[PDB]
Design a protein around this ligand. Structure first.
Ligand code: FES
Ligand SMILES: [K+]
Ligand SMILES: [K+]
Ligand SMILES: [Mg+2]
Ligand SMILES: [Mg+2]
Ligand SMILES: [Mg+2]
Ligand SMILES: [Mg+2]
Ligand SMILES: [Mg+2]
Ligand SMILES: [Zn+2]
Lengths: 52, 190, 77, 109, 115, 232, 164, 50, 291
RNA sequence: AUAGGUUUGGUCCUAGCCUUUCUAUUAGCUCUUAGUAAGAUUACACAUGCAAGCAUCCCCGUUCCAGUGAGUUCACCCUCUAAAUC
């Protein structure tokens, strides 16, 4: 579900624009893959300690 | 001690006031003493210090029967321009800063009480359209969770972890553990 | 604040930051809550980005903008 | 987006032709005096590429910005000669003129 | 001004006077001072209850959405404020702190009962 | 009551003028001292008289004794009275720029309640005349006699709205911001009305004063301008 | 007094009185006019009275004048596209020239009002900041809110000195 | 503008000296197991790794 | 259907009944004064200026719309019971996006119990004034609107000032606006001060209120005494159209009443003080004959 | 500037200087309370104590914040286009 205020704003905009649909606004999370925090990162992008 | 303290306006309709001032404002004959042709841009703070009057008291302080009260509309009118409706600045009449502040407060109070006439402009409406059909002021359709009494998201509620995960955490944090917390109280304890 | 060239204080050389202890159940519940919250926030952020890009595209190559451009050119001619 | 040169279209008088394929042009703008509130002429010198070397001292020319500067000071090219010095053609009637007098009458055509 | 790296973030800039705080919701470079240069003011927040017993929060929702869509980050207090407004889901730490307070008050009530 | 300063004769009242030999009383007239000078010894006094209702004048009196000079100047002033036309009996009919010898006087008509923001001698003379609202600036040599002469000349040479209406044969209509777009006809010609309108001068060729334009544009910065002062 | 004939021309009010705001296409305006000849009279007045106003409303447009180069006066506008607009102004009054140029190459009042409304949005009345940019500095200036401690001391319970 | 050539020389020299004096993995990631500190820098490792 | 207040017909009759007095409409205001300007004009130019002033007055006298009392806002967006007890004071969230009508602007309240609800009308107006200040409007209700100060205002015959303050302070559909306007109208009717509102934009609303409450007797009598007979006949016609099922309407239809006969029929049918209406009408007719 | 004092035996003109107004620093004398704001003269030299950590090791940060005004048209607009956030 959308957050309460954002859902209310979406519904209000639809009703203002003439749309009378009763379908709930919904956030797609199929494209959001929450990768575990311990997954290996890209070592190629990592830095190196400087010589001192 | 003034006998007009309870009803200050009476003093302005008494014959003593007419003899002293006539029809001119109470500040008409006052003159500030200063060096130069250009006076200081502010008046003295007060003519009365520790219950002692200064040599040249201002028009208000020189008459103890003159009371600055929001009901004494006739007195307050003398310190407001009749053509522009603006309160004179203190150097204009020579009133001290304290009496000027008191006069300004009394004039504002009288205007707020409808006792002193002042210009009220005619203004335009705040909004161009007065419709009240928008959802911001109308009723939004309730969400299914609100109808069912469930939290907006399932993760707002406490779910007891499985025993295996708790044991895994206990192994991960050996020697650095607190007492395990059970489900919290359903309502806020009173 | 200190720069990288400023020496460390001598009263802190033996300082050891002991990690805080962990409540397992609250830890697990908090981890799940963070995962869900970040998922929702990322979805909202992608939608906002899409709206911003759509508004930019409608401002540049929008149908109303193109109609206005053609009308202005015709008026000039 | 079409050029990195600030001044895109400018009109000036040619004041120098001693450089090869380059005309030194004087451009006047109107600048308000902040105190007197009167408009005075402010001058600026521009170098314009003249490939054919058809510019003469004193003629009024139009300069168009180059897509990029071709030299340190050459940022413009000669789009056209608005008024050839002593060889002005009246734009309104299209007839040659010498000052305010017609060399060839409009009625003749 | 050019900062090494950095990003835009929507945060609270503290103004007001001693013992009277007030916050301006501003989108600013993360490296800039707290009350220094900002890109745009996106709202305000008065943390002191007024004569009506209300904490007033003003949010420029259109511009907030625009700057979030432009890649701006959010400070944690702003995430909590937006969760309170209902613009975002409630932040996990609000829920966790509510549960902690519930347990603490339950312990206090149990102490009272034991006494 | 003191005059302009504690030790100054200027601004001090001399009382009503004496009854004249003609048999006329002047109890409604007030006399004010404008200048006292030692003539090398005798005393020369410049005084002004006025009834506060448009009738005013000024005179010089020379005598060995100061009081005799006062009396002579007052009695001669009452017999050389000007009449000053007043717009609504509080201000002048229009702005007046004049130069008498080396003394320049720029006077500006002002709305009601504006007060007398003018040279102190001009304030005294206006009070004698009955003018209550006006602005005045004096430039060049500040010579009291020249100032008085120029002031009286300019005030006596002002054209009223009725005179302008008769001259142009047209309605003189007043526009007030406080009254909105309502046209207030303040004067109409006694004779017939001309049917052709005034030329709509696209840009009039008027002589503007740099001080007024500078004040209007906000470039005037004087610390001495618009200072708070006692009622005048 | 102010120097020169028609000193009103050198006041900001007159300079702002102009009604010609060129479209963004215009870059250069050349004014060829004759110092003598009755048929060019308006053009001379156009140079005398209205060029300052046009330049004031169009600071970035290069305005250039030419004298006694052609038998008749004319105006030429150069546009960014390279198109040239020739306006014959012989026998025309200065007001007529202003109206013509406003009609053919001047922004209409609709565009100007749209621009003004766009400028309005930049100064949001709800924003708090210095008076140079915002109506109010602090929320304490709003009635009903907790006032500034500078003017009204806060209660002892709300002050850290007496909370510590 | 008066050129700043010493800055050019310094940056080039520092780049060369950093490319030629690279610390190796055996030096960077060595550890003193008794104190659990890096000999290269002297910084101690976090407690949770000990 | 029954005519609305904003209908072209009703607006035309109310506009004609209000009148247009340029001196009262553009009375000299007490404010910062500037030196007046002067123009030399012919008769034709003066007439042009007069008609332009008439147009300006017509724009100024535009009647405000008459609106019904707004329904209270009682809507709940969410109930997050987890937040109950975590806060002591409510949070008010106002969406200050500039290009939104104030009646479409989302304003919400998170209460201490955790309920996210929509702000009430009073809270909405207060927040709008806080963040979009309007000249003449105060965030806190001025004390002039207390009924004691309102009696004082009425005693000073400053009803127009009261209505201007009400328009500046309250929304047209708010309860306070309706109550103050109705109280002012009641005072005017009780003390016969209708002329105070003539040539003002509130006269139409006052007439609408009187007609809808069936208390036009005093206004009709005042109009007859002021020889505004056309206004009285138009008032009777407006009463009939607003109440076409009333006894006066059928009486006028049956007796074919036009002009003065309409007033007579109304006085005989649906007048609370029809006797005095008849007396005043008879006196007006007698004076007309004598003149 | 609403101006005023001052040249001469005297008048007028020209012209300087000063007075009246509002700020800031310092000095003399004097000084009760509460709140708020502001706070080395010196790019002269500095005792002493703190001002940068975090983190399952890698990295990241210490290039920020804070300070000063020595030097001084590197600050603003357009074009192009690195690094950084999404
Ligand atoms: S300036 Fe707002 S609290 Fe002080
Ligand atoms: K790290
Ligand atoms: K410096
Ligand atoms: Mg003295
Ligand atoms: Mg001098
Ligand atoms: Mg001497
Ligand atoms: Mg001291
Ligand atoms: Mg990149
Ligand atoms: Zn006093």
């Amino acid at each position: 579900p959308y957050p309460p205020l954002l859902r209310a704003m979406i519904i209000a905009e639809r009703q203002k624009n003439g749309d009378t649909s009763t379908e709930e606004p919904m956030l797609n999370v199929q494209r959001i893959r929450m990768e575990p925090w311990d997954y290996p990162a890209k070592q190629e992008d990592k830095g190196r300690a400087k010589g001192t | 001690i003034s006998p007009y303290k309870d009803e200050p306006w009476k003093y302005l309709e008494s014959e003593e006031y007419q003899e002293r001032y006539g029809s001119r404002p109470v500040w008409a004959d006052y003159r500030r003493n200063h060096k130069g042709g250009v006076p200081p841009q502010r008046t003295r703070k007060t003519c009365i210090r520790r219950n002692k009057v200064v040599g040249n008291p201002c028009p208000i302080c020189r008459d103890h029967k003159l009371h600055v009260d929001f009901r004494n509309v006739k007195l307050l009118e003398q310190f407001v321009c009749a053509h522009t409706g603006i309160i004179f600045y203190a150097p204009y009449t020579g009133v001290c800063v304290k009496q000027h502040k008191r006069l300004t407060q009394a004039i504002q109070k009288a205007r707020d009480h409808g006792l002193l006439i002042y210009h009220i402009p005619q203004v335009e409406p705040r909004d161009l359209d007065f419709s009240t059909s928008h959802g911001a002021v109308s009723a939004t359709p309730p969400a299914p969770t609100l109808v069912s009494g469930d939290p907006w998201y399932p993760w707002y509620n406490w779910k007891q972890p499985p025993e295996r995960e708790l044991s895994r955490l206990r192994r991960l944090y050996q020697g650095h553990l607190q007492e395990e917390s059970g489900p919290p109280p359903e309502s806020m304890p009173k | 604040r200190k720069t990288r060239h400023d020496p460390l204080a001598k009263s802190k050389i033996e300082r050891v930051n002991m990690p805080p202890a962990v409540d397992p159940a609250e830890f697990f519940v908090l981890m799940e809550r963070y995962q869900h919250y970040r998922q929702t926030v990322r979805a909202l952020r992608m939608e906002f980005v899409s709206e911003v890009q759509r508004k930019v595209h409608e401002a540049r190559a929008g149908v109303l903008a193109e109609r206005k451009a053609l009308k202005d050119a015709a008026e000039h001619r | 987006v079409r050029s990195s040169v600030h001044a895109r279209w400018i009109v000036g008088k040619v004041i120098g032709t001693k450089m090869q394929k380059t005309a030194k042009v004087r451009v006047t703008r109107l600048v308000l005096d902040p105190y007197l509130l009167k408009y005075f002429n402010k001058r600026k010198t521009y170098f314009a590429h003249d490939a054919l070397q058809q510019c003469t001292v004193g003629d009024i020319v139009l300069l168009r910005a180059l897509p990029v500067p071709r030299a340190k000071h050459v940022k413009h090219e000669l789009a056209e000669i608005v008024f050839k010095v002593g060889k002005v053609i009246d734009p309104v009637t299209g007839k040659p003129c010498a000052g305010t007098t017609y060399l060839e009458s409009p009625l003749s055509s | 001004k050019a900062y090494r790296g950095g990003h835009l973030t929507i945060r609270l800039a503290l103004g007001g006077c001693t013992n009277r705080p007030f916050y301006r919701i501003v989108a600013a470079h993360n490296k800039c001072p707290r009350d220094g240069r900002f890109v745009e003011q996106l709202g305000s927040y008065d943390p002191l209850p007024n004569s009506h017993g209300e904490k007033l929060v003003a949010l420029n929702l259109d511009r907030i959405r625009h700057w979030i869509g432009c890649g701006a980050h959010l400070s944690k207090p702003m995430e909590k404020l937006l969760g309170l407004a209902g613009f975002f889901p409630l932040h996990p730490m609000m829920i966790t702190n509510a549960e902690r307070l519930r347990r603490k008050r339950a312990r206090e009530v149990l102490l009272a009962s034991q006494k | 009551e003191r005059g302009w300063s504690g030790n100054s004769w200027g601004g001090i009242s001399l009382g009503p003028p004496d009854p004249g030999p003609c048999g006329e009383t002047y109890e409604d007239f007030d006399t004010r001292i404008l200048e006292v000078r030692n003539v090398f010894k005798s005393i020369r006094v410049l005084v002004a008289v006025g009834n506060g209702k448009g009738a005013a004048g000024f005179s010089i009196g020379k005598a060995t004794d100061r009081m005799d000079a006062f009396r002579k100047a007052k009695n001669r002033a009452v017999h050389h009275l000007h009449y000053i036309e007043r717009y609504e009996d509080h201000t002048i009919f229009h702005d007046i720029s004049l130069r008498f010898k080396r003394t320049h006087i720029k006077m500006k008509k002002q709305p009601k309640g504006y007060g007398l923001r003018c040279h102190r001698a001009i304030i005294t003379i206006c009070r004698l005349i009955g003018i209550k609202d006006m602005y005045a600036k004096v430039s060049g040599s500040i010579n009291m006699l020249s100032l008085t002469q120029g002031l009286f000349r300019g005030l006596s040479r002002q054209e009223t709205h009725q005179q302008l209406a008769d001259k142009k044969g047209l309605h003189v209509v007043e526009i007030r911001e406080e009254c909105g777009p309502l046209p207030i006809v303040v004067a109409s010609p006694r004779g017939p009305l001309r049917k052709d309108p005034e030329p709509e001068d696209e840009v009039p060729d008027v002589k503007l004063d740099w001080e007024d334009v500078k004040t209007a544009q906000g470039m005037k910065r004087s610390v001495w301008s618009n200072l708070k002062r006692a009622a005048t | 007094p102010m120097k020169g004939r028609f000193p009103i021309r050198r006041t900001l009010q007159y300079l702002s009185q102009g009604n010609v705001v060129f479209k963004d296409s215009v870059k250069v305006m050349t004014v060829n006019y004759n110092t003598h000849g009755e048929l060019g009279e308006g053009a001379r007045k156009f140079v005398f009275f209205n060029i300052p106003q046009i330049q004031y409303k169009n600071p970035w447009v290069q305005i250039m004048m030419f004298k006694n180069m052609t038998p008749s006066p004319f105006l030429r506008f150069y546009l960014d596209s390279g198109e040239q607009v020739l306006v014959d102004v012989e026998t025309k009054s200065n007001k007529e020239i202003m109206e013509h140029i406003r009609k053919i190459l001047g922004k209409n009042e609709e565009t100007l009002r749209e621009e003004e409304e766009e400028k309005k949005q930049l100064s949001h009345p709800a924003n708090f900041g210095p008076r140079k940019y915002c109506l109010r500095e602090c929320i304490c200036e709003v009635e009903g809110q907790v006032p500034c401690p500078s003017l009204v001391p806060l209660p002892k319970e709300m002050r850290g000195k007496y909370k510590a | 503008v008066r050129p700043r050539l010493i800055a050019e020389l310094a940056r080039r020299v520092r780049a060369l000296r950093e490319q030629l004096n690279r610390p190796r993995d055996s030096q960077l990631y060595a550890v003193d197991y008794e104190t659990l500190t890096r000999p290269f820098s002297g910084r101690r490792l976090p407690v949770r790794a000990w | 259907k029954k005519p609305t207040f904003m209908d072209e017909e009703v607006q035309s009759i109310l506009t004609k009944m209000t009148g247009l007095n340029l001196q009262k409409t553009f009375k000299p205001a007490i404010q910062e004064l500037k030196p007046p300007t002067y123009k030399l004009m012919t008769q034709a130019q003066l007439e042009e200026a007069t008609r332009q002033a008439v147009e300006a007055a017509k724009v100024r006298l535009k009647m405000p719309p008459v609106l019904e009392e707004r329904v209270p806002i009682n809507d709940v967006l969410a109930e997050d019971k987890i937040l109950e007890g975590t806060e002591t004071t409510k949070y008010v969230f106002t969406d200050i996006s500039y290009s939104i009508p104030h009646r479409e602007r989302f304003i919400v309240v998170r209460e201490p119990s955790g309920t996210l609800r929509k702000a009430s009308w009073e809270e909405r107006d207060r927040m709008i004034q806080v963040y979009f200040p309007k000249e003449g409007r105060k965030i806190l209700t001025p004390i002039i609107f207390k009924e004691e100060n309102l009696r004082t205002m009425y005693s000073q015959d400053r009803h127009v000032d009261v209505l201007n303050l009400c328009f500046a302070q309250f929304e047209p559909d708010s309860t306070e606006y309706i109550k103050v306007h109705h109280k002012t109208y009641e005072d005017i009717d009780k003390r016969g001060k209708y002329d105070l509102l003539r040539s003002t934009r509130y006269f139409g609303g006052m007439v609408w209120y009187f007609v809808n409450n069936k208390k036009i007797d005093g206004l009709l009598i005042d109009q007859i005494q002021r020889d505004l007979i056309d206004d009285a006949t138009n008032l009777v016609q407006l009463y009939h159209v607003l109440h076409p099922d009333g006894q006066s309407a059928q009486g006028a239809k049956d007796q074919a009443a036009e002009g003065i006969n309409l007033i007579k029929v109304f006085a005989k049918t649906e007048a609370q003080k029809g006797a005095y209406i008849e007396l005043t009408l008879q006196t007006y007719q007698e004076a007309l004959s004598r003149h």
